[PDB]
Amino acid sequence: DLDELKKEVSMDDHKLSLDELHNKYGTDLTRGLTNARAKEILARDGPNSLTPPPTTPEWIKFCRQLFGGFSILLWIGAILCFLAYGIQAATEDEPANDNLYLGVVLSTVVIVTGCFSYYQEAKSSRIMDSFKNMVPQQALVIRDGEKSTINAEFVVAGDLVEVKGGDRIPADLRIISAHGCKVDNSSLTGESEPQTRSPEFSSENPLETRNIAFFSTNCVEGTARGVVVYTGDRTVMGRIATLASGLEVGRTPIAIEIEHFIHIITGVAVFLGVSFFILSLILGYSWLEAVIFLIGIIVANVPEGLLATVTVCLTLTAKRMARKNCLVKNLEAVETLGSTSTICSDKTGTLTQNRMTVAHMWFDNQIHEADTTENQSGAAFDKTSATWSALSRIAALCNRAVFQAGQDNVPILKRSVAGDASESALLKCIELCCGSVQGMRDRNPKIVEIPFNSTNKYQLSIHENEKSSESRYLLVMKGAPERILDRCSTILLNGAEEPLKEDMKEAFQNAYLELGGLGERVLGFCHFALPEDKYNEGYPFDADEPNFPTTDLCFVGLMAMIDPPRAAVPDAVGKCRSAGIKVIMVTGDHPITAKAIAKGVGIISEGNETIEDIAARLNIPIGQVNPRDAKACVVHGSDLKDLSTEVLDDILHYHTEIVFARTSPQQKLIIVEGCQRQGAIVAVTGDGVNDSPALKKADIGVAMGISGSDVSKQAADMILLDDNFASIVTGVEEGRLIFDNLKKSIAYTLTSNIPEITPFLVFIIGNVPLPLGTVTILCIDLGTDMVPAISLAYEQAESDIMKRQPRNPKTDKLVNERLISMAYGQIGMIQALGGFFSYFVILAENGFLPMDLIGKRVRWDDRWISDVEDSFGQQWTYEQRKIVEFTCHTSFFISIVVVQWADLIICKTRRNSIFQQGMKNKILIFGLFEETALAAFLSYCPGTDVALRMYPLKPSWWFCAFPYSLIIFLYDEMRRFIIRRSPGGWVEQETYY
Amino acid sequence: GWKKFLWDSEKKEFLGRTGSSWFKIFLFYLIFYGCLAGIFIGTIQVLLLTLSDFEPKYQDRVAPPGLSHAPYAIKTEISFSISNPKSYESFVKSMHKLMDLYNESSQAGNSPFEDCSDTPADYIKRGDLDDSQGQKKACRFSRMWLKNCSGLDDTTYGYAEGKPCVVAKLNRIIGFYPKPLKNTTDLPEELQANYNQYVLPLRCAAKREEDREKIGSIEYFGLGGYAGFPLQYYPYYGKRLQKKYLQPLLAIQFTNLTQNMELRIECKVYGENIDYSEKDRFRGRFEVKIEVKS
Amino acid sequence: EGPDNDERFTYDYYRLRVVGLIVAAVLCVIGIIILLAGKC
């Protein structure tokens, strides 16, 4: 699978002849191949079917979720815990089982997190599998001189294949004879209109010539013949799909932030461990014990619940998107939208609707605009004049297209119409603002019609007049505005008729150039009432001689048409630009249309100008003007092929409104890479297969759901099941909101760290009884704390998020030193002091004053000393003093909850005050209530001092942590005050997360 | 990166900041932590002002007194060879440490020791738990009272010829009055004989029914010759109000002990305000695993 | 008081546990109320 030979632009043998082609592959132009030869080739190279994607067993994507960066840290933590347990078992008798419990708990946490994440990605995979609808297809091949319909998987290279309007091109054919055969190259080449396929060659580029049919393309109208040149995976879209599958995935931003976070956590953990290891060796302890101390401090500095909290947090933000019809296949792809700073979009199928629609109409020397929006939410065009009625009659009559049977349910715009695109748009507009066309057509019987000639460039027909008072005949013709203009002498103004003096002729020329400059295709409709005295009701006007006056007709008005954009496209583009997101158009369509669509959707803001526009406004050559005075630039694909890396970098560095036209899929990928080379996040939004190499390499791909291709849908990361573009704005908003929330939750789960470690450090340095047990640390990190941290995600914005500039990736991180200085440095310290306060209080009320506690651990732990004198002289047995120590663990845990109240309140907002934002988050309130109920339940329920070792507390102890909590609240309140009054001051660059 | 973030020479920065910055941060943390320490100290001083020096506010975790002994057993087992002298040294050393506090030289003069009834007697109340009267007075407890286990005659105390001793002691509790069982028809078998009301009885036995036969003659030594604690040594007024206070002791000689076999001996005290616990094996009773292997 | 000062060594932990449980239950209920207050 040579990638370089697949990265190159497609080549071909189009520039040849029919004899050279038949001589190279071997095939009879009038008899085709033989059955024996056909089967020989079929078995010689393989069926004309694309290879299936690389399957994936379910146990693989499960082992993947069990690993990563966070789960790996928890894995090493469990390993360390079991190592310390082994050492304690082989070195000391009666080894405590604390470490074995902590290790099995860590393993269970990792397994549960993996199961949840895997279940979510499986849910998305099922709803994704319910969209692949593959119905078998059979092609028409001519062998030995006979026509036969065989499965698409049996077509080989060399046989003759015939196509008919409505069928799909099986393989890559070389047209040999066509009869007005049009093809739809929107999916592969992105051409919005049907390009006619002719046996002759026209352009050096195989995608531009008309003598080559492409795989997966459909023949709109006409019939054609052709020799299969390319078959199977070797086709154009086959190489494109193989290239897409042979591309890497990448590494999103949220993952990099989590990685740097783990880097800091491990830095401070190994630092505190190696330091207290040298210190313990300096105080007399043995090596065997110091090793256990090192492992214990390292394990103690690992957040077991931050993993489950982060996963549930992200999942919560994913369900809303699923409520608005925005589905993400992965789980971290929900934040990439918020960090995006350059969105590369596609035109056909993404920015537009890929459907021809009547845009402007000319009548009564006045340009009228029609509604070209999917849901028909706009302004009417004043349907009160007679001119409009005559125009409707001309369009509704001189038209051979008719809605496909059985469409009485779909809307007027989304129904299937059999015919050309122009006639379909005209029929839809008439059926939209003029009622049932079937009755309008049956109301006037068509007598004689002259088809559309390539020379006549006009379609005319005569029908009877439905006027019950006039039995005359009506003649209606339509065609190019110039040809029709040269055949008229009157004008239907406001109903009456008038001459065709040069005044209206010049107004018609200006109208023609006005509608033409808009990138639209304009047509002209005219009619005439045949005098019943010279052509009676019985005379038959056979289409043989000049039976109708070609000239002296009555021109009624022009009718333009073009593919419009989706409803929420301009608003979404404006919203993205407001948030500082650079919108760059990338499409393989004509530049004359790409520029118009760009200006109409907001990519090229009204007022900006290109070098060609300046040269045209000044009437001077283009080589004289300076390229620095042009903000917007239109880069052609042909020119892009001959451009160096530095040139592309400068193009993106100096032009703010860039539009890449006529760019091949490979060029699209090159553009995405050129955008990433600088350092900005990229989001590519597409629908066809030409966007597959762009959606894969981009930081985040957005594929359309209804109008999107299966390849681009399978290679993208986010799917828009409703084809709504405003979802991009919603996503960029949610990506930021959940980011500030992740910061708050991380600081919350990190503040408790200190009051959980400090006790052991003072235990080894000061030799005091153990303050915080292991089952209490577990009841804190994996119990109470979970609900509040999860609730911190439901926090609303503080300021306008859709107003600030995108976060800088090289400077503004997720976990900086400003957070560590708060959680580990100021709040956690106060919480630890409060815990030690409740501790000393419990031991002072029972008889052990603070002066006699320093230096007792040796006898306080000894299991054979049944006489420990306290500060008053009483003798305490071993189990009695142990009961008191356990009650001190229970009160320490409750003190932790008490200080966590004020920590969750000061963590709710990062800058704003509580009296401003407000306590409108019901989840946070529920978290506090549950957090307290759980602590009371764990202490007062009978049989807990036996199972978990937690004794009941006396109502006077529960109030030992209250002052510390209020102090924490006041300190953070004054903190979040100087930041507001003093922007940019010390408190901001020192404590502003 | 590695080198720059450590020391650059254009902005004259070290680790990231200039000279004046590390100073601003260090000064801020010093003032902050200083205030934290002062606040914690104040909140601890008010706590010192909340407690009394003559009595523990809560005395419920020490209501049923324990029963400890003189030898220090690692797993409540006494195993020693009658030949190798370096086998029972850890025992004699402890025993000696305990009895070394009842030396007559320590108990001398009128203050603060007072001669009490040579025969068990009743309680003695030296007033309330106040500082009005000076240091209260405690009764004297002579070594010699313990006859064959005193370290005055046979320093080893018995361990020399297969006849070890075990000095039992009741855990000191402030304001605790020991109360013995009354003479009513319900009383254990053992306790009937020698019902001196003023004596708290201590009686050892065998954990299992089999071991009975293998245990010989439990000879107890105590005040007045009884196997208990005289009520006159109570109550205890606490260290502050009664320094130089001695708690009664009871010696137990396990004469006629079967050789080369682990014997489980459970000793137990009897009384009203005495209750045992299935979790704490030292509350009121105690267990010893003697094995005189020779 | 005096010899029969047995109360000086007793604490009614039973009643304390009963009250602490009643309170815990109440707090849990209130929490649920607040959580579901709005979805009905």
Ligand SMILES: *[C@@H]1O[C@H](CO[C@@H]2O[C@@H](C)[C@@H](O)[C@@H](O)[C@@H]2O)[C@@H](O[C@@H]2O[C@H](CO)[C@@H](O[C@@H]3O[C@H](CO[C@H]4O[C@H](CO)[C@@H](O)[C@H](O)[C@@H]4O)[C@@H](O)[C@H](O[C@H]4O[C@H](CO)[C@@H](O)[C@H](O)[C@@H]4O)[C@@H]3O)[C@H](O)[C@H]2NC(C)=O)[C@H](O)[C@H]1NC(C)=O
């Ligand atoms: C409480 O009383 C303890 C015993 O008191 C003795 O008996 C009472 C009734 C009175 O008569 C009193 O006057 C007696 O002293 C008392 O402990 C005793 O302290 C002395 C002084 O250190 C010890 O004497 C020394 O003995 C060692 C060898 O001891 C052997 O036996 C003991 C057991 O008894 C073992 O533990 C040892 O390991 C030995 O196996 C001698 O080597 C040592 O020599 C020193 O003196 C000689 C002159 O005699 C000098 O030439 C040397 O250079 C040395 O300076 C002493 O003779 C005595 O052993 C010890 N008794 C016990 C049982 O340990 C205790 O201190 C008192 N405590 C308080 C707080 O009042």
Ligand SMILES: *[C@@H]1O[C@H](CO[C@@H]2O[C@@H](C)[C@@H](O)[C@@H](O)[C@@H]2O)[C@@H](O[C@@H]2O[C@H](CO)[C@@H](O[C@@H]3O[C@H](CO)[C@@H](O)[C@H](O[C@H]4O[C@H](CO)[C@@H](O)[C@H](O)[C@@H]4O)[C@@H]3O)[C@H](O)[C@H]2NC(C)=O)[C@H](O)[C@H]1NC(C)=O
């Ligand atoms: C604590 O309690 C014991 C037992 O008390 C007895 O049982 C209690 C449950 C309760 O019912 C008491 O009312 C009851 O007395 C006290 O010890 C007992 O003392 C008596 C009197 O000395 C003894 O009875 C003697 O029994 C002898 C044979 O066993 C008999 O020969 C004795 O004769 C004496 O009395 C007769 C008149 O009956 C007289 O004629 C004789 O000349 C001679 O004096 C006498 O009947 C019991 O055996 C004792 N019980 C035991 C277990 O030894 C004990 O004194 C008491 N302690 C205190 C401090 O109060």
Ligand SMILES: CCCCCCCC/C=C\CCCCCCCC(=O)OC[C@H](COP(=O)(O)OCC[N+](C)(C)C)OC(=O)CCCCCCC/C=C\CCCCCCCC
């Ligand atoms: C029994 C007793 C109990 C004891 C309990 C102890 C509990 C432990 C509590 C806290 C642990 C502290 C450990 C150190 C934490 C430092 C945090 C840290 O390393 O965070 C990482 C930051 C990175 O941040 P960033 O990503 O934003 O960088 C972006 C840079 N870009 C963008 C320019 C490229 O790196 C930096 O900050 C740079 C590194 C700065 C390192 C400073 C080291 C100071 C440590 C000790 C000083 C002691 C001196 C005492 C004497 C005072 C004089 C009297």
Ligand SMILES: CCCCCCCC/C=C\CCCCCCCC(=O)OC[C@H](COP(=O)(O)OCC[N+](C)(C)C)OC(=O)CCCCCCC/C=C\CCCCCCCC
């Ligand atoms: C000595 C002991 C020390 C203890 C220290 C720890 C303390 C931590 C616990 C509680 C702290 C409470 C802090 C009180 C803050 C009140 C702030 C407030 O009232 O700001 C008013 C806001 C602002 O409104 P606005 O103008 O934006 O509205 C605009 C409406 N428009 C848009 C229609 C115009 O109004 C709103 O937020 C809407 C109404 C919200 C009402 C909230 C009431 C609930 C408050 C606390 C719950 C209790 C938790 C107890 C935990 C213990 C469990 C056992």
Ligand SMILES: CCCCCCCC/C=C\CCCCCCCC(=O)OC[C@H](COP(=O)(O)OCC[N+](C)(C)C)OC(=O)CCCCCCC/C=C\CCCCCCCC
């Ligand atoms: C929206 C949804 C709402 C759902 C809310 C659900 C809330 C559920 C509320 C209550 C159910 C809790 C479980 C009930 C446990 C009953 C245990 C019990 O009745 O024990 C009685 C006996 C004690 O007898 P004794 O006094 O004679 O013992 C003397 C022992 N001496 C003398 C040797 C010291 O027990 C014994 O003997 C053996 C003791 C056995 C230990 C069982 C304790 C379980 C341990 C940990 C599980 C707790 C996890 C936390 C879950 C939180 C959920 C929110």
Ligand SMILES: CCCCCCCC/C=C\CCCCCCCC(=O)OC[C@H](COP(=O)(O)OCC[N+](C)(C)C)OC(=O)CCCCCCC/C=C\CCCCCCCC
């Ligand atoms: C959504 C909100 C959730 C809230 C729930 C709170 C989360 C809790 C988080 C961590 C706590 C789990 C730690 C497990 C502790 C097991 C302790 C253990 O095994 O100790 C072993 C003891 C032995 O003790 P010893 O040597 O003194 O015996 C001497 C006996 N002699 C002397 C008489 C012979 O044996 C015994 O206690 C025998 C009785 C066995 C008791 C097993 C209790 C298991 C408790 C919890 C496990 C299920 C939790 C699942 C919920 C997860 C929530 C996310």
Ligand SMILES: CCCCCCCC/C=C\CCCCCCCC(=O)OC[C@H](COP(=O)(O)OCC[N+](C)(C)C)OC(=O)CCCCCCC/C=C\CCCCCCCC
């Ligand atoms: C049991 C637990 C008890 C806990 C109690 C904690 C109480 C301690 C609270 C605060 C004490 C710390 C004061 C430190 C003052 C020296 C700091 C210093 O040297 O600062 C210098 C700067 C002035 O330099 P510059 O910005 O002009 O230079 C620009 C330079 N460039 C560019 C780097 C920004 O200072 C400034 O900015 C002004 C900023 C001053 C910092 C205000 C922080 C106030 C926070 C809390 C006070 C509220 C206590 C409430 C307690 C109620 C108890 C019931």
Ligand SMILES: CCCCCCCC/C=C\CCCCCCCC(=O)OC[C@H](COP(=O)(O)OCC[N+](C)(C)C)OC(=O)CCCCCCC/C=C\CCCCCCCC
């Ligand atoms: C905005 C957020 C609202 C949040 C509301 C949350 C709801 C709170 C729910 C319940 C709290 C009430 C608890 C009442 C329980 C009393 C039960 C009782 O009988 O308990 C007696 C103990 C005395 O125990 P002992 O050891 O002496 O005897 C032990 C004797 N043995 C052991 C021998 C039996 O006493 C105790 O537990 C004392 C109980 C604690 C006293 C409550 C203090 C309230 C503190 C601040 C609130 C101030 C509000 C001011 C209004 C401002 C309006 C604008």
Ligand SMILES: CCCCCCCC/C=C\CCCCCCCC(=O)OC[C@H](COP(=O)(O)OCC[N+](C)(C)C)OC(=O)CCCCCCC/C=C\CCCCCCCC
């Ligand atoms: C949508 C609306 C939802 C509403 C739901 C409402 C739920 C119901 C709410 C409250 C129910 C209250 C139940 C009160 C139970 C009292 C039990 C009690 O007082 O037992 C105490 C005694 C044990 O005393 P001890 O002598 O061994 O003490 C130790 C003494 N030393 C250690 C010094 C020797 O019990 C014993 O003996 C026998 C104990 C037998 C086992 C009883 C099981 C109780 C366990 C859990 C039930 C509590 C759940 C409350 C809801 C909390 C939600 C988080």
Ligand SMILES: *[C@@H]1O[C@H](CO)[C@@H](O[C@@H]2O[C@H](CO)[C@@H](O)[C@H](O)[C@H]2NC(C)=O)[C@H](O)[C@H]1NC(C)=O
């Ligand atoms: C101490 O125990 C010994 C047994 O070890 C008792 O003496 C035995 O008595 C039986 C008769 O009942 C004789 O057959 C044995 O020969 C004796 N053995 C020895 C070593 O003497 C002795 O009576 C016990 N003494 C006490 C006071 O309990």
Ligand SMILES: CC(C)CCC[C@@H](C)[C@H]1CC[C@H]2[C@@H]3CC=C4C[C@@H](O)CC[C@]4(C)[C@H]3CC[C@]12C
């Ligand atoms: C138990 C006691 C004695 C330990 C006291 C440790 C104190 C002095 C430690 C704990 C956390 C530390 C701070 C943690 C974070 C930062 C941010 C960094 O960019 C510079 C160092 C600085 C500012 C540290 C200074 C020293 C510090 C406050």
Ligand SMILES: CC(C)CCC[C@@H](C)[C@H]1CC[C@H]2[C@@H]3CC=C4C[C@@H](O)CC[C@]4(C)[C@H]3CC[C@]12C
């Ligand atoms: C608001 C903050 C900064 C005020 C903190 C005040 C601190 C420094 C004050 C409050 C209470 C004071 C203590 C109160 C009690 C004692 C006991 C006395 O025998 C000597 C002084 C000593 C040891 C004091 C030292 C200073 C102290 C701890």
Ligand SMILES: CC(C)CCC[C@@H](C)[C@H]1CC[C@H]2[C@@H]3CC=C4C[C@@H](O)CC[C@]4(C)[C@H]3CC[C@]12C
């Ligand atoms: C919003 C803020 C200010 C409310 C603070 C409420 C605090 C003070 C409440 C919440 C839970 C309460 C405790 C819950 C449980 C018990 C056990 C019970 O047997 C006596 C009351 C006692 C000891 C309570 C004392 C007051 C308490 C701690």
Ligand SMILES: [Mg+2]
């Ligand atoms: Mg497209």
Ligand SMILES: [Mg+2]
């Ligand atoms: Mg933890």
Ligand code: NA
């Ligand atoms: Na990707």
